[PDB]
Design a protein around this ligand. Structure first.
Ligand SMILES: CCCCCCCCCCCCCCCCCCCCCCCCCC(=O)N[C@@H](CO[C@H]1O[C@H](CO)C[C@H](O)[C@H]1O)[C@H](O)CCCCCCCCCCCCCCC
Ligand SMILES: *[C@@H]1O[C@H](CO)[C@@H](O)[C@H](O)[C@H]1NC(C)=O
Lengths: 292, 238, 203, 99
């Protein structure tokens, strides 16, 4: 199940100021960027053009090139038409299709001031249940534009799935790539008196799915709290798993790492081991300004 | 239908001028354009509905107001000779945009040079009557300023359009002058038998647009207000 | 300008065909409209064009649109006199209430009448009230004659003007000349080219 | 609505003292998108800092990753200073290899 998304970020400071930046993700790999400082959509991968020829790309780029300018002015006129709502204004757009055979569900979500309010469904734009009522009038206006509504329908029903099926094969090499995680141990005072928070750092692994647990032999320590996936510049991932122990309970515990790149043979970092000791000695510091 | 008022106006530098527009079409959008040679219509102000008013491409000098769905005004608080133009008022979703009949505005530095037209009717020549069995009548409006005249021919109480043609453009009586007065000519051609009837009445009517009942006037001669000046001739048996 | 038109002004002999051009750079180009402007009146819509390649028709008028060429052509088949007007090409950038119309300078179409029997002459017409004041009428010449203005400042001459006697189906060209001053109708239109058989009646 | 930024400072590799590394600063959960982010060594703006393109997650909150080349030592302080409209004062979160 691969999810492809085009993310548009449009800001309006006033009547005379606006910028639009775009980014494009397949799974968790960035394929395209489009800065407000540039009249051309940029490839961030050697395979970002998909299975589309030069002529097919230039026509689609120009299609969007026309859209970026138009969108800006269309919004600015809607503001004047609602002049009820004032500047500054933030608009976000999320659009694309999910892959499953030939089946694919397409979407186009719109948020106004950081809250989801509009989506394109079937043949027209619609307001979300529990949305501002003043949004009806602009929606009524946007629907009277058959050409834009036809273009969107084309892009959602036909273009997205035919293009994304092209990318998935074009970048099969980078998607199936395997990167080995590296782990190192740490500890910090728990927020509770007499307690200690152990930390298992796990960095550099690709793809994303990973398993990290604290173990006493054959028993996974149920107090193991899995962290949030933090990105690295080389599109790999960092994650930490933490365990709260009473001072003294450190010994005999281990951090176990399961990742597809390791291929059976896990990483087992034991607390207090000669390796753990050697890693920690290479890490000492004056502790300013440690976290409160 | 898009109604405009007035259709013609003569104003002085630094005066207040309001051009009123109207439509009974239940339209949301309205526009104010001005038309100048070698340009094509340019947008000054527009609206999306009652209350709202927005700047177009050339709002400098002009303000706008929309109190109801029907009305839309263009307000020139301090008038300039550079605001001399023909003004059009449109309505509709830019789906069909409908346009107004237009307003000729002339703004002048001094109202002292404003003159009403002297009108003359010239009777057919016997040479034309003998040779063509047709008779042409020439009307001449002379010494008027600025060029804001509507000419019409009135045969026996009713206004005619057949056999008529009037100069599209007037002429300056002195080409080498900016404050030059204008002259305009017109023709009405009827059959010899029609002209030879003594009971047939012919009138040339020139509607002049000049000063209004508000504009101040001191110069010792007659005031050059908006008026109709007419000359006339009757048919002759010989 | 985002919209240009050619030619500046066009001249056609009544009954022949007339071809008008429009070229633009308006982005995006949703639709293109042609208007007609009778002298002293508003803009009346003739036709609208929607498709990338559109071929529309209405009455005598027929128009084509090519969006990839950003070009349009208005044809008038068998022109009438009452077709003498300014023709303006208008492009709408977006097909919604949020769009904005772009206008062209327009083409000034002038239709000259087909005079089958010319009868060139210059008559003198005396003022109704004052026998003294008089004018010169140059009338009934064929449409291949151009009227020139005076080199002498004291002499005023008007341009040609087509008049239609609807009931008799008779068209005629006419120019007027008058002078405050030596002036005689026989030599009023001396700057114009005068037909070899123009009738000059003796006063 | 204006949501305040969360700041997380971590390293791409295990912190070995005197061994060159890469320090990441990952700012999340903020809105609107306009934001100034600096990385500091001993309280001084680091000469060359690279930044990824700004994106946003499933709950419409913008996130952006800042990162620089750096060498951890026993006494050199590293931080991430962040100016955003939601805060009246910039937020400085120091690197804590132990956290
Ligand atoms: C989009 C999913 C498909 C994915 C496949 C693409 C793969 C390629 C990836 C390359 C990276 C591209 C960068 C990502 C871009 C972000 C995605 C944007 C998708 C939206 C596409 C919009 C359709 C384009 C139609 C368009 O240009 N349309 C413009 C011109 O249209 C004109 O001109 C048209 C063409 O000549 C014909 C039409 O008749 C005419 O009107 C319209 O002016 C655009 C306005 C529509 C957007 C409004 C949405 C706002 C929602 C309301 C929010 C409330 C806020 C208001 C309150 C103040
Ligand atoms: C696009 O797909 C929708 C369902 O998502 C369908 O209702 C609609 O008819 C389709 N339109 C076109 C033009 O294919």
């Amino acid at each position: 199940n691969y999810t492809f998304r085009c993310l548009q970020m449009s800001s309006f400071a006033n009547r005379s100021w606006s910028r639009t930046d775009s980014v494009v993700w397949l799974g968790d790999l960035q394929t395209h960027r489009w800065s407000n400082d540039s009249a051309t959509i940029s490839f961030t991968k050697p395979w970002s053009q998909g299975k589309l020829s030069n002529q097919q790309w230039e026509k689609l780029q120009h299609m969007f090139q026309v859209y970026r300018v138009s969108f800006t002015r269309d919004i600015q006129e809607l503001v004047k038409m609602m002049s009820k709502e004032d500047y500054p204004i933030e608009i976000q757009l999320s659009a694309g299709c999910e892959m499953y055979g030939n089946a694919s569900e397409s979407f186009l979500h719109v948020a106004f001031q950081g809250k989801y309010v509009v989506r394109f469904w079937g043949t027209s734009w619609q307001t979300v249940p529990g949305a501002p009522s003043w949004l009806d009038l602009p929606i009524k206006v946007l629907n009277a534009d058959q050409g834009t509504s036809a273009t969107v329908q084309m892009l959602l029903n036909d273009t997205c799935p035919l293009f994304v099926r092209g990318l998935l094969e074009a970048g099969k090499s980078d998607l199936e790539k395997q990167e080995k995680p590296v782990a190192w141990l740490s500890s910090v005072p728990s927020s509770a008196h007499g307690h200690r928070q152990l930390v298992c750092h796990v960095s550099g692994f690709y793809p994303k799915p990973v398993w990290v647990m604290w173990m006493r032999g054959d028993q996974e320590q149920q107090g193991t709290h899995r962290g949030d996936f933090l990105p690295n510049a080389d599109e790999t991932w960092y994650l930490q798993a933490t365990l709260d122990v009473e001072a003294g309970e450190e010994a005999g515990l281990a951090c176990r790492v399961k990742h597809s790149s390791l291929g059976g043979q896990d990483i087992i970092l034991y607390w207090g081991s000669l390796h753990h000791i050697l890693d920690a000695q290479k890490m000492v510091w004056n502790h300013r300004h440690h976290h409160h | 239908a898009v109604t405009q008022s007035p259709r013609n106006k003569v104003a002085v530098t630094g005066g207040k001028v309001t051009l009123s527009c109207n439509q009974t079409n239940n339209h949301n959008n309205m526009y104010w354009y001005r038309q100048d040679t070698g340009h094509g219509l340019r947008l000054i102000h527009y609206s999306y509905g009652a209350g709202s008013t927005e700047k177009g491409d050339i709002p400098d000098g002009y303000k706008a107001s929309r109190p109801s769905q029907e009305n839309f005004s263009l307000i020139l608080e301090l008038a300039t000779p550079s605001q001399t133009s023909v003004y059009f008022c449109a309505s509709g979703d830019a789906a069909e945009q409908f346009f107004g009949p237009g307003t000729r505005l002339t703004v002048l530095e001094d109202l002292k040079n404003v003159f009403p037209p002297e009108v003359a009717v010239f009777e057919p020549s016997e040479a034309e009557i003998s040779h063509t069995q047709k008779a042409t009548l020439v009307c001449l409006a002379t010494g008027f300023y600025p060029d804001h005249v509507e000419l019409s021919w009135w045969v026996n109480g009713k206004e005619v359009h057949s056999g008529v043609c009037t100069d599209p453009q007037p002429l300056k009586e002195q080409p080498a002058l900016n404050d030059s007065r204008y002259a305009l000519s017109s023709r009405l051609r009827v059959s010899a038998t029609f002209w030879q009837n003594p009971r047939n009445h012919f009138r040339c009517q020139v509607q002049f647009y000049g000063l209004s009942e508000n504009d101040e006037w001191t110069q010792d001669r007659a005031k050059p207000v908006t008026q109709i000046v007419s000359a006339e001739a009757w048919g002759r048996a010989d | 300008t985002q919209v240009e038109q050619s030619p500046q002004s066009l001249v056609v002999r009544q009954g022949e065909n007339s071809v008008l051009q429009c070229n633009y750079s308006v982005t995006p180009d949703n639709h293109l409209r042609w208007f007609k402007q009778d002298t002293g009146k508003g803009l009346v819509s003739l036709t609208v064009l929607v498709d990338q390649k559109d071929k529309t028709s209405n009455g005598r008028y027929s128009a084509t649109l090519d969006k990839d060429a950003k070009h349009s052509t208005l044809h008038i088949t068998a022109t009438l006199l009452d077709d003498t007007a300014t023709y303006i090409c208008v492009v709408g950038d977006r097909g919604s209430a949020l769009g904005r119309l772009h206008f062209g300078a327009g083409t000034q179409l002038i239709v000259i009448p087909d005079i089958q029997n010319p009868d060139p002459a210059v008559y003198q017409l005396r003022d109704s009230k004052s026998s003294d004041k008089s004018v010169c009428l140059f009338t009934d010449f064929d449409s291949q004659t151009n009227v020139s203005q005076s080199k002498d400042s004291d002499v005023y001459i008007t341009d040609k003007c087509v008049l239609d006697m609807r009931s008799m189906d008779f068209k005629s060209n006419s120019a007027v000349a008058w002078s405050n001053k030596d002036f005689a109708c026989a030599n009023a239109f001396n700057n114009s080219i005068i037909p070899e058989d123009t009738f000059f009646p003796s006063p | 609505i204006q949501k305040t930024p969360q700041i997380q400072v971590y390293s791409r590799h295990p912190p070995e003292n005197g061994k060159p590394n890469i320090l990441n600063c990952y700012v999340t959960q903020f809105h609107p998108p306009h934001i100034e982010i600096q990385m500091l060594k001993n309280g001084k703006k680091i000469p060359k800092v690279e930044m990824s393109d700004m994106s946003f997650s499933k709950d419409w909150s913008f996130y952006i990753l800042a990162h620089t080349e750096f060498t951890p030592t026993e006494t050199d302080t590293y931080a991430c200073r962040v100016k955003h409209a939601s805060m009246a004062e910039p937020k400085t979160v120091y690197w804590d290899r132990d956290m």
